[PDB]
Amino acid sequence: HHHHFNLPPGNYKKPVLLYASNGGHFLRILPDGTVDGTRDRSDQHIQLQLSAESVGEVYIKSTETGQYLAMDTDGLLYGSQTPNEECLFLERLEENHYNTYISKKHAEKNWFVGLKKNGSVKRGPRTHYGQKAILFLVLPV
């Protein structure tokens, strides 16, 4: 293990929003595989579904398009048609309150899912522990 094992209460059954504490954007996976954020709560592409593959390990999937959130070899988030090793994230509690998502493939590099205040997602190497960008609240809809 390269990381701690504080887990959030799990939310896998229901479709959810991933709300970025850092600026209030919702994580969005567009039909063309682009990943960003939007503050438009009505957007059809911010509805996500998480599934636990192993304890503490998740897929994050678009309910609208079926795409899997993934992080590529250069640290960029993308929407994948099929589940692969780039699609698994370590779901952890952070600051006793938030959820973080670490790339499993790149766990030793501490690459996180992260949203900037301007609604663009962060590249893996530009994320790290202690940032606001990595902090999510998983909201039921």
Which residue segments constitute the domains of the chain, with CATH numbers given? 1-141 (2.80.10.50)
Taking alpha carbons only, the member of 110, 97, 12, 122 closest to residue 57 is: 12
Residues 127 and 101: their CA atoms lie apart, in Å, by 11
Contact between residue 61 and residue 27 where contact means Cβ atoms under 8 Å apart:
no
Position 30, amino acid: L
Angle at 74 between CA 68 and CA 48, to 5 degrees: 20
DSSP reduced 3-state for 18? strand
Long-range contacts of 109-112 (CB under 8 A, 24+ apart): 110/2, 110/3, 111/71, 111/75
Position 117, amino acid: K
What is the full DSSP assignment across 47-82? -EEEEEEETTEEEEEETTT-PEEEE-TTS-EEEESS
Taking alpha carbons only, the member of 86, 69, 87 closest to residue 78 is: 69
Residue 63 has, within 13 A of its CA and on its CB side, a CA count of 17
**Experiment used for this model:** X-ray
Helix and strand tally (H, E) in the chain? 0, 10
Q: How far is CA 46 from CA 62, 112, 126, in A?
A: 7, 18, 23
Residue 96 annotated in ligand binding:
no
Position 4, amino acid: H
What is the full DSSP assignment across 97-113? TEEEEEESTTGGGT-B-
- Are β-strands 136-140 and 15-20 bridged in parallel, bridged antiparallel, or unpaired? antiparallel
Q: How far is CA 127 from the centre of its chain?
A: 13
